[PDB]
Design a binder for this molecule. Structure first.
Ligand SMILES: Nc1nc2cc(-c3ccccc3)ccc2c(=O)n1C[C@H]1CC[C@@H](c2ccccc2)O1
Length: 329
């Protein structure tokens, strides 16, 4: 392989992980690879909460290439807060290495229970510079600037549960990962990997909707107005009193998403947004679709989309490449 590949492992068909190294001695970490954020978050040995004790921790004291930064990072949420500081050190992705400014995480006081139960260590962003904290050039951008890769692009071939493993490839596109035509959609903004597509479900239509391609989202996000109209008489029921949608797995009235442009047509069948829940009932499935409303009519194409479609992320050409992922390698 003339390109840099990192193997992707599936986690119960809801999320996937990838491993990368931090430090001179190449300390290994399990990462969530996220195109919806743009920073590298690594837990520190200076993190002493219960959850952190069970994680792989970055010890800057055991790395020759560690360069002190110290710039405080405190990201606040309700639920909770993520505290830390910036650090610079050698980041190894596959067989490539470069000095990189990342965030050393000291405190995760909100997410302590879920983090513990989680099987990942940190988060590796794959968005754009303007999406990052502290104006940090994306790893792939930085790598090409350093003449370490052919092209400023990375590609996602996601793993399928119980079927096959996946790969993150940096620097080049490999034909083995996809079938059918490979079509490009130019970004409408250099922030998220967001493109402009027309969405169609049955006769329900929405045109020139902002579509964000995001590997950090387990579901498919749809405008609430769009969701209610598409689930009209399809033998699909809302849970009381929550926004959960349940249906029979064999529901023949289940529609297919259709995202079209001037260059390509992208469809997502029921087999891609249905999650089996045989616990509650025989032949019962849940719709992995969330009704979410942004100021602009926006779809979020999370894992269920990328699970079907091999994707290309081009910084140089400011575009997203989309093609039918091969079902077997
Ligand atoms: N992919 C992703 N990654 C995140 C990572 C973080 C995060 C939190 C702590 C440390 C590092 C990253 C927070 C939120 C998101 C988060 O919301 N997303 C989802 C993407 C899809 C849409 C976009 C977005 C845009 C506006 C409002 C809410 C969400 O973010």
């Amino acid at each position: 392989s003339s390109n840099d590949n990192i193997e992707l492992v599936d986690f119960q068909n809801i999320m996937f992980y990838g491993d990368a190294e931090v430090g001179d001695n190449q300390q290994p970490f399990t990462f969530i690879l996220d195109t919806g954020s743009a920073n590298l978050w690594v837990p520190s040995v200076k993190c002493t909460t219960a959850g952190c004790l069970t994680k792989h921790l970055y010890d800057s004291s055991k790395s020759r290439t560690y360069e002190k930064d110290g710039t405080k990072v405190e990201m606040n949420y309700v639920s909770g807060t993520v505290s830390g500081f910036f650090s610079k050190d050698l980041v190894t992705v596959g067989n490539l290495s470069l000095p990189y400014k990342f965030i050393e995480v000291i405190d995760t006081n909100g997410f302590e229970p879920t983090y513990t139960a989680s099987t990942f260590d940190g988060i590796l962003g794959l968005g754009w510079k303007d999406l990052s904290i502290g104006s940090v050039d994306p790893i792939v951008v930085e790598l090409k600037n350093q003449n370490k890769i052919e092209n400023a692009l990375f590609t996602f071939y996601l793993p399928v549960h119980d079927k096959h493993t996946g790969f993150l490839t940096i620097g080049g596109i490999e034909e083995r990962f996809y079938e059918g035509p490979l079509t490009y959609e130019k970004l409408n903004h250099d922030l998220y990997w967001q493109i402009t597509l027309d969405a169609h479900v049955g006769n329900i239509s929405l045109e020139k909707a902002n579509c964000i391609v995001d590997s950090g989202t387990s579901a498919i996000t749809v405008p609430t107005d769009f969701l209610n109209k598409m689930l009209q008489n399809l033998d699909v029921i809302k849970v009381p009193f929550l926004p959960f949608y349940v249906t029979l797995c064999n529901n023949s009235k289940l529609p297919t998403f259709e995202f079209t442009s001037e260059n390509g047509k992208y469809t997502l069948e029921p087999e891609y947004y249905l999650q089996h829940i045989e616990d509650v009932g025989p032949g019962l499935c849940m719709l992995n679709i969330i009704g979410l409303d942004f100021p602009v009519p926006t779809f979020i194409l999370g894992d269920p989309f990328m699970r079907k479609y091999f994707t290309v992320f081009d910084y140089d050409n400011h575009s997203v490449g989309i093609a039918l992922a091969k079902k077997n390698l």
